[PDB]
């Protein structure tokens with residue numbers, strides 16, 4: 806089984822803007838999650854070939870990872886902070902769907918999600 810192409814991280818036809826919330830998502834939320842000791846499996850797309858998971862992309866149809874989210878933020882791909890937050894949620898949800906409760910990767914995702922939610926709770930009001 807082949808890996809799909811990674812999610813799109815740039816599109817020159819999409820409009821671009823800077824907002825304080827998007828800045829916070831990059832400078833605070835992503836920065837904090839990236840350095841967490843359990844972040845490493847979430848820092849790039851799931852390579853189902855190398856991990857030998859032939860059913861991964863049969864089960865997960867909307868893949869997402871923090872490497873892709875990082876690239877989207879740096880490319881000004883997101884217009885709304887909500888789009889970025891949705892991508893984080895998709896990343897966590899995908900992990901919980903593919904894997905089983907109590908699995909190592911699930912416990913790792915749960916730790917990251919807790920931290921994510923703590924940082925999103927301090928998302929500044931739109932300027």
Ligand SMILES: COc1cc2c(cc1-c1c(C)noc1C)ncc1[nH]c(=O)n([C@H](C)c3ccccn3)c12
Nearest residue numbers: 845846847851852856858899900903904909910913
């Ligand atoms: C056991 O799950 C993974 C293990 C990964 C991974 C992605 C996943 C993963 C994620 C994330 N969501 O579904 C899967 C499957 N990406 C890279 C990577 N490098 C790497 O060595 N792993 C192993 C197998 C690992 C790490 C942590 C916990 C359990 N197993 C992994």
